[PDB]
Amino acid sequence: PTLEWFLSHCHIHKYPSKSTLIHQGEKAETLYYIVKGSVAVLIKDEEGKEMILSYLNQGDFIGELGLFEEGQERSAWVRAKTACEVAEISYKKFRQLIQVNPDILMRLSAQMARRLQVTSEKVGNLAFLDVTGRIAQTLLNLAKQPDAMTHPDGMQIKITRQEIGQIVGCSRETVGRILKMLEDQNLISAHGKTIVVYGTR
Amino acid sequence: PTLEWFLSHCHIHKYPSKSTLIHQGEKAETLYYIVKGSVAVLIKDEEGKEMILSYLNQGDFIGELGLFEEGQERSAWVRAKTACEVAEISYKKFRQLIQVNPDILMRLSAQMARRLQVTSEKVGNLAFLDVTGRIAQTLLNLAKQPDAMTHPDGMQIKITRQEIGQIVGCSRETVGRILKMLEDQNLISAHGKTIVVYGTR
Structure with a gap:
């Protein structure tokens, strides 16, 4: 119900495996929701060596931190781990959808909360x-x-x-x-x- | 306007410097927001000493992670660093507010967003x-x-x-x-x- 409604407002793209969906430093104007498949969030050093920060899976959003800034750039690479179906939607348009039905934002916020709940913030x-x-x-x-x-x-x-x-x-x-x-x-x-x-x- | 409208649904109380707003181990049923002042989040270290985990100031929520799992318990103590005005509202009523004006969820999630962004920076x-x-x-x-x-x-x-x-x-x-x-x-x-x-x- 909620998800299907939300999904009708997205552009749903297919990414084959190993393809790059998001370049670090790219303009951050969109929110993604993983309909199917998995992606790796990753960073690279000065020689191209790679460090994979995490995998995101079906039911996960990507780029949600950008929704609360104004036009920062992506802080990492995002690369399809398996063949993926990714819903995409402008931050602008998502901010309008939230008014019609806050339930999808409550989902995005739960994800952030779970994430935060398993991260050490203590240094x-x-x-x-x-x-x-x-x-x-x-x-x-x-x-x-x-x-x-x-x-x-x-x-x-x-x-x-x-x-x-x-x-x-x-x-x-x-x-x-x-x-x-x-x-x-x-x-x-x-x-x-x-x-x-x-x-x- | 969002903040005033939300604050109008909270209880507000003055906390003197050094008073304890929250006790590690209480059940988690309320959301806090700092209208004025600064508090410290603390735990007990190796063997049982006090442990500052972070500071929160005017315009910060406290206990927002609790909004997401009903029933959990306070993971830390929270205490006034300066004289404090603090607003409070139960999680279940905040949920109702969400249905009426999702914007107040936007602001709470912005703060999660900032916390996740600092966490990213140590990586x-x-x-x-x-x-x-x-x-x-x-x-x-x-x-x-x-x-x-x-x-x-x-x-x-x-x-x-x-x-x-x-x-x-x-x-x-x-x-x-x-x-x-x-x-x-x-x-x-x-x-x-x-x-x-x-x-x-």
């Missing part, structure tokens, strides 16, 4: 950032060395908690906590004395 | 964490120098973006984004050459 204090940075730096320096090992997800390195702690000036209590964090953030995997530093080469 | 790869850690280190180090000086909120230093960009080895573009993020996480404030590094005060 640590400056000493914590500082020591997180030293570790990250240590990992990356290691991954650059001639005897770094190759791995399917980046370079792999051999180094212990103790060794990092001493290199960097902190406890294992502290090496462990940061490494687990980095792992939960999808930047590394660490098993035993081995760490895979993702996207190094 | 990065290892080299970003590394540079983030190098700026924080630099700041903390300056704050312990003789060039530095006591401030109410922590220790004032004066250093330019180009100058940090230099010590640390990154673009000013990069410094600015990181300064902005540290300011958003309530760890520093920065006005031109002047930065105050909050601490132990």
Whole structure:
């Protein structure tokens, strides 16, 4: 009912898999709703290396943060992961639809709320950032060395908690906590004395 | 006009500096909005100390995430930092308001939007964490120098973006984004050459 009404006001596009729906830096004037399929939100570095921030799926909106600004540009790339059917609608026109039936905005807002509910907003204090940075730096320096090992997800390195702690000036209590964090953030995997530093080469 | 019209459906109360608006663990049935003043969101840290998570000021909602799952509980304590005027309304009545004028949902969702946008800003790869850690280190180090000086909120230093960009080895573009993020996480404030590094005060 609500969704079908909403969908009739959208342009519904098909994107085959691997195609790019949204360029970072593009003008943000539209809202998207995923009718079917999945897309990756991603960023790239100065060499084209890629980091996938998340997948969005059927029932998800894309670009909803733009609805509340005035004309900022897209902050990331969006690329079809499977063949996708994406409803698109101008922010301007969506602002009018919300008046006829706030229920679709209540859906968009629930998504933001769920998202926010699973995101840490807490950062640590400056000493914590500082020591997180030293570790990250240590990992990356290691991954650059001639005897770094190759791995399917980046370079792999051999180094212990103790060794990092001493290199960097902190406890294992502290090496462990940061490494687990980095792992939960999808930047590394660490098993035993081995760490895979993702996207190094 | 939206705000006045919404406020006219709220209860408003004066809260003196240091009073507690919300207790971690109460059931979550009400939405708050700050008509005047500033409050702090707090939890209990490792072992049970107080934990500032963030500040909210005139024109902010409080407990908006609760609007989305009925029944949940308060995740934090909320307390007045200054003298406060705070409006409140149950989630179920706010839902009715939504049906009458969806605009007040637009404003609440704008604030979710801003929270999600700051959260986005801490996200990065290892080299970003590394540079983030190098700026924080630099700041903390300056704050312990003789060039530095006591401030109410922590220790004032004066250093330019180009100058940090230099010590640390990154673009000013990069410094600015990181300064902005540290300011958003309530760890520093920065006005031109002047930065105050909050601490132990």
